[PDB]
Amino acid sequence: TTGIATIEVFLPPRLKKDRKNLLETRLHITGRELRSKIAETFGLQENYIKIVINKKQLQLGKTLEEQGVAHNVKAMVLELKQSEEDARKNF
Amino acid sequence: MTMSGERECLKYRLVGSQEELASWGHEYVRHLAGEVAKEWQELDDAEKVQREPLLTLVKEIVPYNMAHNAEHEACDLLMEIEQVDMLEKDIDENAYAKVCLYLTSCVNYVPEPENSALLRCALGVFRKFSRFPEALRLALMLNDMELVEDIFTSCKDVVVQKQMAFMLGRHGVFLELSEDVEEYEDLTEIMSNVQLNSNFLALARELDIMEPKVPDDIYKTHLENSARMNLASSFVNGFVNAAFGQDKLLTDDGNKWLYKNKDHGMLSAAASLGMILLWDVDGGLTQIDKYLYSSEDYIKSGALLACGIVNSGVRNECDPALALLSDYVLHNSNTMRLGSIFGLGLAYAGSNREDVLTLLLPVMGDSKSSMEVAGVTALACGMIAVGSCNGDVTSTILQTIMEKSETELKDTYARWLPLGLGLNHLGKGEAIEAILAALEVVSEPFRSFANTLVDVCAYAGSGNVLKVQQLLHICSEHFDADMGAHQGVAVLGIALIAMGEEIGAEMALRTFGHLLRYGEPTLRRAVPLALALISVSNPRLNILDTLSKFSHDADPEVSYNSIFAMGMVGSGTNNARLAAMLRQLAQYHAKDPNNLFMVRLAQGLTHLGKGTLTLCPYHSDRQLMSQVAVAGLLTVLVSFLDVRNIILGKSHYVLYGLVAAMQPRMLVTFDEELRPLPVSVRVGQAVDVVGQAGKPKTITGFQTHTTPVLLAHGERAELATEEFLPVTPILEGFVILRKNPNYDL
Amino acid sequence: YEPPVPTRVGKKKKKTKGPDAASKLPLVTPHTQCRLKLLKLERIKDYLLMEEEFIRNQEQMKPLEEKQEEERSKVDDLRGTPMSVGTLEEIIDDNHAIVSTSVGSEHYVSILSFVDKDLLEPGCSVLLNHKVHAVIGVLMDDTDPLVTVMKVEKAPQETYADIGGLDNQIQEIKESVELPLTHPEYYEEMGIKPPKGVILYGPPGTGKTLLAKAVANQTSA
Amino acid sequence: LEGRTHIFKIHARSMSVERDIRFELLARLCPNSTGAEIRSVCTEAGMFAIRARRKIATEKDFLEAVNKVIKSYAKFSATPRYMTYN
Amino acid sequence: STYSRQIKQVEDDIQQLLKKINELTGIKESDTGLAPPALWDLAADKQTLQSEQPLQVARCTKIINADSEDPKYIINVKQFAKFVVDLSDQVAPTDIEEGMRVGVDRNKYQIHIPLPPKIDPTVTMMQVEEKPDVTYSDVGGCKEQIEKLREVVETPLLHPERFVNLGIEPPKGVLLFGPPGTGKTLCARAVANRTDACFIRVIGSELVQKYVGEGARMVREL
Numbered sequence A: 001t002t003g004i005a006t007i008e009v010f011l012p013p014r015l016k017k018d019r020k021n022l023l024e025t026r027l028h029i030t031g032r033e034l035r036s037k038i039a040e041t042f043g044l045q046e047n048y049i050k051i052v053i054n055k056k057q058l059q060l061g062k063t064l065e066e067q068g069v070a071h072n073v074k075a076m077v078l079e080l081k082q083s084e085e086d087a088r089k090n091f
Numbered sequence B: 001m002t003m004s005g006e007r008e009c010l011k012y013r014l015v016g017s018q019e020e021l022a023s024w025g026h027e028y029v030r031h032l033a034g035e036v037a038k039e040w041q042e043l044d045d046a047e048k049v050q051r052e053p054l055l056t057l058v059k060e061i062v063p064y065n066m067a068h069n070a071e072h073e074a075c076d077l078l079m080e081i082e083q084v085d086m087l088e089k090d091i092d093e094n095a096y097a098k099v100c101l102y103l104t105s106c107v108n109y110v111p112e113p114e115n116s117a118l119l120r121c122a123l124g125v126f127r128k129f130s131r132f133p134e135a136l137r138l139a140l141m142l143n144d145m146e147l148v149e150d151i152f153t154s155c156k157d158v159v160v161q162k163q164m165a166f167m168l169g170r171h172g173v174f175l176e177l178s179e180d181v182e183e184y185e186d187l188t189e190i191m192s193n194v195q196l197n198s199n200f201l202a203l204a205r206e207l208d209i210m211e212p213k214v215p216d217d218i219y220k221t222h223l224e225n226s227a228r229m230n231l232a233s234s235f236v237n238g239f240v241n242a243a244f245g246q247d248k249l250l251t252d253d254g255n256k257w258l259y260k261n262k263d264h265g266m267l268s269a270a271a272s273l274g275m276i277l278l279w280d281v282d283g284g285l286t287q288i289d290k291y292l293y294s295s296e297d298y299i300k301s302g303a304l305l306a307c308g309i310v311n312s313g314v315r316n317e318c319d320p321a322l323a324l325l326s327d328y329v330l331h332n333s334n335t336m337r338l339g340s341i342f343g344l345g346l347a348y349a350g351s352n353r354e355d356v357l358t359l360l361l362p363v364m365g366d367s368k369s370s371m372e373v374a375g376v377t378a379l380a381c382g383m384i385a386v387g388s389c390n391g392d393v394t395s396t397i398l399q400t401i402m403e404k405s406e407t408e409l410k411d412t413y414a415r416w417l418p419l420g421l422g423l424n425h426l427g428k429g430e431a432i433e434a435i436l437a438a439l440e441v442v443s444e445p446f447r448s449f450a451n452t453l454v455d456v457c458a459y460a461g462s463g464n465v466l467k468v469q470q471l472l473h474i475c476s477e478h479f480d481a482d483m484g485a486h487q488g489v490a491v492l493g494i495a496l497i498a499m500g501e502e503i504g505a506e507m508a509l510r511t512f513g514h515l516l517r518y519g520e521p522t523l524r525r526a527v528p529l530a531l532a533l534i535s536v537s538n539p540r541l542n543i544l545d546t547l548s549k550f551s552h553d554a555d556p557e558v559s560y561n562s563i564f565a566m567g568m569v570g571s572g573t574n575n576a577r578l579a580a581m582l583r584q585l586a587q588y589h590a591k592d593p594n595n596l597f598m599v600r601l602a603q604g605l606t607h608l609g610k611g612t613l614t615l616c617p618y619h620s621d622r623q624l625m626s627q628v629a630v631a632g633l634l635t636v637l638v639s640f641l642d643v644r645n646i647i648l649g650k651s652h653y654v655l656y657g658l659v660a661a662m663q664p665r666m667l668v669t670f671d672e673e674l675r676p677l678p679v680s681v682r683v684g685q686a687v688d689v690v691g692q693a694g695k696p697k698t699i700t701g702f703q704t705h706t707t708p709v710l711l712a713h714g715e716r717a718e719l720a721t722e723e724f725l726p727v728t729p730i731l732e733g734f735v736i737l738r739k740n741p742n743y744d745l
Numbered sequence C: 001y002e003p004p005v006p007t008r009v010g011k012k013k014k015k016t017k018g019p020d021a022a023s024k025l026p027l028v029t030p031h032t033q034c035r036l037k038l039l040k041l042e043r044i045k046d047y048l049l050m051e052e053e054f055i056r057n058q059e060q061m062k063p064l065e066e067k068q069e070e071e072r073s074k075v076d077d078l079r080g081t082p083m084s085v086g087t088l089e090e091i092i093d094d095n096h097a098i099v100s101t102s103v104g105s106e107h108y109v110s111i112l113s114f115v116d117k118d119l120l121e122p123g124c125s126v127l128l129n130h131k132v133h134a135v136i137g138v139l140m141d142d143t144d145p146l147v148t149v150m151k152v153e154k155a156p157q158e159t160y161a162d163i164g165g166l167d168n169q170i171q172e173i174k175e176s177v178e179l180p181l182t183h184p185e186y187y188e189e190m191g192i193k194p195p196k197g198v199i200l201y202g203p204p205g206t207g208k209t210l211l212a213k214a215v216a217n218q219t220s221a
Numbered sequence D: 001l002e003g004r005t006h007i008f009k010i011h012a013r014s015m016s017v018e019r020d021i022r023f024e025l026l027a028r029l030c031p032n033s034t035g036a037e038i039r040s041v042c043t044e045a046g047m048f049a050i051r052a053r054r055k056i057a058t059e060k061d062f063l064e065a066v067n068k069v070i071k072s073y074a075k076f077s078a079t080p081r082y083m084t085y086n
Numbered sequence E: 001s002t003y004s005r006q007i008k009q010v011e012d013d014i015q016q017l018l019k020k021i022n023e024l025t026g027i028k029e030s031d032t033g034l035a036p037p038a039l040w041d042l043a044a045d046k047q048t049l050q051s052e053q054p055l056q057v058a059r060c061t062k063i064i065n066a067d068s069e070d071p072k073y074i075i076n077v078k079q080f081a082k083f084v085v086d087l088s089d090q091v092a093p094t095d096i097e098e099g100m101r102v103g104v105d106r107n108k109y110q111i112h113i114p115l116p117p118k119i120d121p122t123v124t125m126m127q128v129e130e131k132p133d134v135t136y137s138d139v140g141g142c143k144e145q146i147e148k149l150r151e152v153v154e155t156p157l158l159h160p161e162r163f164v165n166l167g168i169e170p171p172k173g174v175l176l177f178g179p180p181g182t183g184k185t186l187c188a189r190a191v192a193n194r195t196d197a198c199f200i201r202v203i204g205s206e207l208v209q210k211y212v213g214e215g216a217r218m219v220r221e222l
């Protein structure tokens, strides 16, 4: 409805929150904005999270509709150790 | 009654007085009832006008037999005349448990089509008497997905349904419920085993064995008077700390250890990291990401395989593993694929999900796909669609097989293609003749290998003495290797079929002795694997002594295979006696790098999960067979027919197929709200209680423990007190306890 | 040079003695003459037919040298005659051991394959080849004269009915030497091992030895 | 007293005892008793119930067991003489 | 009872089958200590009876001219005789020391293999090979006692690294004393079950022997 999709996300058990939590956002935004806002909505650090959408890793550059997202889609938050650039820079 | 009584004893009773049958004596009707079945076989189709009084007697003989506790005789009357349909109408509350227990014990020896008929009839008694949890067990044995739906939704006791969802999750059978069903959320969580990691970790804290174990603590070299060595300890570290999430060697800064291995040694070492994180999809994926960006090709794909391990045995509502592995199944580098398909197979083994299979299918037909990944593709898609008879995976497996040239069929990575075909028809039985028809076109000796593998997998866990008749006929003709490649599967076939029940299984050991004696090297190179399959995670002394004698065999392959089987037989049992033999075997085989690698492998499997994990495919009192577990069991053991080139070679990652069979030996009593509820329980060796009436004890030589205890092979569990009423009579896995109203009256 | 490393754990013989050996047929349950017992017995019969057919086929095309009567006939040739009786001193390896002849001389000999390796313990009587002294068998030690003296071959004719007045005394001794053997289920369901030891004390002639005679009369041990 | 209660629980772990067996009371009824006596008390407690054809041992059986073992068999007790040696 | 007739028919056929199976399989008898025929490597035994020659157990006494290239070894062949022999070509000169048991041939008595020292079979049986079924959880009221016992006899073997680093020499002996039935042997049985090193059980009455110097001798070989 009205350009907003029902995105159900999953939280790791370390953050003892309601695993059946709901995130609401537009679809014109890209994965970069999506990744940032999930960290805020459930009290998480954005630098160390990976996101799984529509059974495929959340590509940050491409926008949501061109990613392949849809209504009533399921998501997950993946806790990260060492940043994506930090892990590459590590060795 | 005194003489033979052929068509006489029934005749005078049939024609004479038709009063109450028991008025002439219990011994008379017992004679009369037997003759009823005798002439029933003699009576043909045209003699249907002769059975009118015959049906009347059985409507009175059956009530008489159950009146004087002679119930096992009653079930016998309907079985011979093939009229077991009418038994359920006359079953009473005081004797429902005896008839089903008797009939269910009979389904392992009666052949088709009476297998299902006796199973459905026993199912009918449970359904009528509102014993849903045991009715679901019979449905699972029947592999009737529609019945599983009907059994699940018919129950209105959600507490029973919550406990039922555990059994489906333990078997790996997933059920897609409707949102209209009450308590939909927790029901999907219970069967998906998402809470398995936390529940498994809860026991580890309770059983104060959370501390990590270094392979040195397992080797114990201080009591003893290389790339392969480092790779061996990678498996030992993974096996011992499996599904724990903590380790002193890889959970710490493991780059020094991870790079200590070389060539494909780093492939399994990186993959071993996910085995410590087995069932921990959320926290486990948090640790692999560091090794996922490694520039070295082996580490990334080894991690890519470590993806599939971390979701293995767990079903996520949206899958993480497919996201991490979808874009690497068609990578140009063969190693990167190798960690993709094999990982993808373990993550969704026993799913029959179309999205992964369609993503995994074109890999097998890829031109750049080597035989190594092509066989891995067969192993994976066979594992996803195990026991489903999915024609789509079936079509390509044939399609790849006969397209290949005769020369490359000599390669032992092509042996995995029939295994994928066999796994896809695992346990179906009579559903392979159409497939066996297609296999005649394939050339020899692979056709001899191919048809044997699928035919064995068709009758897995069936006990069909007719099917094992032909396999020994293959074992009878000995070839003076190349022509006798299929001979190994034939020996492995006896284990796969006879494993269903105990009586069939230990006949196989006697035959397995002669094959190790009269058989050719290639014939006797597969007997230890059959021992491992027939008694996985069941460390009996007869097999272990048998495997010990051929540990130091003249034939090197029998030597490696026996040592692996010894650890495989005692997989996760933490046997103190068996570990001493391996430690002694380590000293003896210290100067043999090939033999010593199996020795270290067996020590890790012996201490798998620190004694809290099993690889046995049978749970629910060893009556219900897990298709996923055999798929990993078959994948490793069939690959061990070429231990020199696959295990000892560059494809030792196939040992991670055992993850699909890794499950906890669990007895956790949960409250109705699913919180832990520790109570006193009695754990002891299981006792057969068929026959003898009254109340016979089902456990002998038992001890009383708190519930969070580990049950190895062959021990049952009974509640010591009557304060709580279990939902399932089978006290295995996760069990929900209900407070007894009679208690504290 | 390096010392040989045994593959067998320990230096003692197998604890199990006098088993059914290859005739350890399974305990088919229940004993009642019904269909599944017939079904269970048929499965045992079926695999024997499979076993019988397979073994016959192998021996049919086995070489004339390799036959069941030929190999046993050969075994005597490797053993030879006479078969010297020695004493096992130490098990150096799986196929190597130190044995001592009756003359007190020790020899480092090789243990042949056909010898029952599970019966080998130091101090046991072994059968050695006359020429090469190789271990070619284990002599089942005859019953010691000391064994015969302790063992009561024939149960005494004194029964519990021949004991008068010791009702409580008879009852207590049964729960420690008779009831555990005849009815072990009572103890198992109760979760207690039977009373370990018992002593009978009192004035001379009170019936202490008589109760043991009654115990020995009605015992299967 | 704490140790004797612990030994009672170890030996009465597999017993089919009642719900309300006062093992702390039983430990108090045998002040200076070896762990072997406590095992016999547990074994004799189930013996009084097996004698009575009862599948569950009540607290009275343990009370009778202490009298039979700790008290009646105190004549043959090795404790009084051996504490002087130790 | 309707299957009583059919039971005995298949039971007798079965019993005839095992008797028939044992005919071809073999394994009948065992009084001469014969292993089952499935383990008969008669081809290797014939080669073993020829390739591997028997060796007489002898004890080296004195090495003459060990420095030079012609070292002569004086051996004591038990009750047979004494010989001055040289080493075989397949054994290093440094592998045979004075006073050690050796294996010598019957032709030239040249030392062929060094041997383990002679140990009384009674002393050998004194080592535990089956661990008892008693754990530390089966001992109650002996908490402080058990930690002291483990930290001397169990901890140093299990985790020796925590003692060498601090220069610690752990105690090498524990005396358990108390009235009978207090748990002295029970705790020792728990030690043997948990220990992974070799455990030898010695009973003081086993060290009492008929002849003079045996008990000291058995302690020496122990």
Ligand SMILES: Nc1ncnc2c1ncn2[C@@H]1O[C@H](COP(=O)(O)OP(=O)(O)OP(=O)(O)O)[C@@H](O)[C@H]1O
Residues within 6 Å of the ligand: C162, C163, C164, C165, C166, C203, C204, C205, C206, C207, C208, C209, C210, C211
């Ligand atoms: N209570 C009894 N009832 C029947 N016969 C008895 C009884 N007490 C003793 N006797 C008889 O006395 C005979 C000899 O006594 P017995 O050998 O049993 O003595 P004991 O009590 O063992 O004493 P001890 O060995 O100190 O002399 C027995 O053979 C038995 O026939």
Ligand SMILES: Nc1ncnc2c1ncn2[C@@H]1O[C@H](COP(=O)(O)OP(=O)(O)OP(=O)(O)O)[C@@H](O)[C@H]1O
Residues within 6 Å of the ligand: D007, D010, D034, D035, D036, D037, D039, E138, E139, E140, E141, E142, E178, E179, E180, E181, E182, E183, E184, E185, E186, E187
């Ligand atoms: N602390 C204890 N906890 C539990 N059971 C015990 C304890 N102490 C003794 N027992 C029990 O009592 C029995 C007495 O045998 P044990 O070997 O312990 O005696 P002991 O101290 O060696 O005596 P003795 O001085 O006569 O040799 C044990 O087998 C055990 O069942």
Ligand SMILES: [Mg+2]
Residues within 6 Å of the ligand: C208, C209
């Ligand atoms: Mg007397």
Ligand SMILES: [Mg+2]
Residues within 6 Å of the ligand: E184, E185, E186
């Ligand atoms: Mg003692």
